[PDB]
Design an enzyme around this catalytic site. Structure first.
Site: not given
Lengths: 53, 395
Positions: B50-51, B127
């Site tokens: 997804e990144h 993150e």
């Protein structure tokens, strides 16, 4: 025998209680132990982990 | 309300659309692929893909993808849950020809640049190093975990840092080539779109696409330096398809210390139904009590008025063209992935109006009473009661 009987007019009466007491404790001790081990299993399975950041 | 028309292509990809007079559209691809389909050796593959999915495809090397979807003036978004992945774009309807094409390459022949691969690894990892700041997400990712033990559902969407560092193109390629099948894909469109034009565009592009058990439990992450405590208590949700879900939503609408939210998270024949509340430590116990009382209250205080109340709030939650394209698309994608069809709002209204107080307390009694709860606490949670106490409402 008679003298003994008179000294404890309840000798027979009692031993019947004691038999009922042994049967009731043999029923009730493992069941109360099982409850206790139910409510104490939660902790006795608790796994602690230290995770310093 | 206009009906949602569904067609099916060679690949098996479904093309669902719900035309509306709004001008823009939200065209998205849903995929039945999440952290539940991962096998602990690729626990962050969906997140890391997804990144990587917006960093260029053969056709759009480098920033091309973002640039064009930027030039056209569209907003490009993607998200991943434990069961579904969505790559959606909101753009000017006249951009449909552009849009479909871009999205196609996102979900197919996406070219993961290892250069980027390394970069994203760092992004995700860093993150995550800070994802700890989102206490609520933490609480909700152990709740899932503590309950769904020894089950794929437990593994978080993000995955263990470990895996994040240890991931390679080929692995990703696998997840991509394994969980991106055409019969498990829905092309959903909402807003100013024509269904025949969208079906022709899906035929032109995208026509190439090739257990769970609830475990009563408790996890108490104690850290006394935090100012507030977050506690979530849940039981096993019926599921996505289970009819009683609706009578449970009304129950949540009856309940509605601090930040006492309520949730009914549904996965494929399972779920978490419960409440999350944040309170100063000294009150945690009390709050717990209150919540428990309310649940049994449903079991005993389903005043018809309140029953109606709950039905009405639920009635004003149903998503619709008014809510907008994205909200609707999103509903079209989830409805085709989970139910296999788009449930119209009239059927939702019928299922709401058939709910009365007696069946609400019947369905509640089945799920809240006598159901070992899953407790997840984080913060100053010493006065948070232990399990024996919690499960034992005794009232």
């Amino acid at each position: 025998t008679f003298l003994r009987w008179a000294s404890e007019p309840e000798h027979d009466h009692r031993k019947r209680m004691g038999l009922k007491m042994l049967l009731m404790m043999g029923l009730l001790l493992p069941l109360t132990y099982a409850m206790k081990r139910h409510k104490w299993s939660v902790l006795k399975s608790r796994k602690l982990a230290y995770r310093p950041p | 309300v206009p009906e949602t028309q569904v067609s099916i292509l060679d690949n098996g990809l479904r093309v669902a659309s719900e035309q509306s007079s709004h001008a823009t559209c939200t065209v998205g691809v849903w995929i039945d692929a999440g952290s539940r389909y991962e096998t602990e050796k690729n626990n962050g593959a969906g997140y890391f893909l997804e990144h990587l999915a917006f960093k260029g495809t053969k056709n759009r090397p480098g920033n091309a993808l973002e640039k064009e979807v930027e030039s056209i003036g569209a907003h490009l978004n993607a998200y991943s849950t434990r069961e579904h992945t969505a790559y959606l774009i909101k753009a000017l309807s006249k951009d449909l020809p552009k849009v479909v094409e871009l999205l196609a390459d996102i979900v197919q022949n996406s070219s993961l640049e290892d250069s980027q691969i390394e970069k994203e690894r760092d992004v995700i990892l860093r993150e995550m190093q800070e994802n700890d700041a989102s206490m609520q997400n933490v609480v909700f990712d152990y709740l899932h975990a503590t309950a769904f033990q020894g089950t794929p559902l437990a593994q978080a969407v993000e995955g263990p840092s470990e895996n994040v560092r240890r991931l390679s193109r080929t692995d990703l390629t696998d997840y991509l080539n394994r969980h991106y099948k055409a019969p498990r894909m829905v092309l959903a469109a909402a807003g100013g779109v024509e269904h025949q034009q969208l079906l022709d565009l899906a035929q032109k592009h995208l026509s190439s696409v090739s257990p769970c058990r609830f475990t009563g439990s408790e996890i108490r992450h104690r850290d006394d330096a935090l100012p507030l405590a977050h506690v979530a208590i849940a039981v096993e949700g019926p599921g996505w398809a289970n009819p009683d879900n609706v009578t449970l939503q009304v129950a949540n609408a009856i309940i509605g210390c601090q930040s006492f939210q309520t949730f009914n998270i549904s996965y494929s024949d399972t779920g978490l139904l419960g409440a999350h509340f944040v309170c100063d430590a000294m009150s945690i116990d009390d709050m717990v009590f209150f919540l428990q009382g309310q649940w049994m209250r449903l079991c005993t205080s389903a005043t018809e008025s309140e029953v109606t109340r709950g039905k009405n709030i639920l009635r004003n939650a149903l998503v619709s063209h008014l809510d907008g394209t994205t909200p609707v698309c999103e509903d079209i994608g989830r409805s085709l992935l989970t139910y296999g069809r788009r449930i119209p709002l009239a059927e939702w209204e019928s299922r709401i109006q058939e709910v009365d107080a007696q069946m609400l307390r019947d369905i509640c009694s089945k799920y809240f009473y006598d159901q070992c709860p899953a407790v997840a606490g984080y913060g100053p949670i010493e006065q948070l009661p232990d399990y024996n106490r919690i499960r034992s409402g005794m009232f």
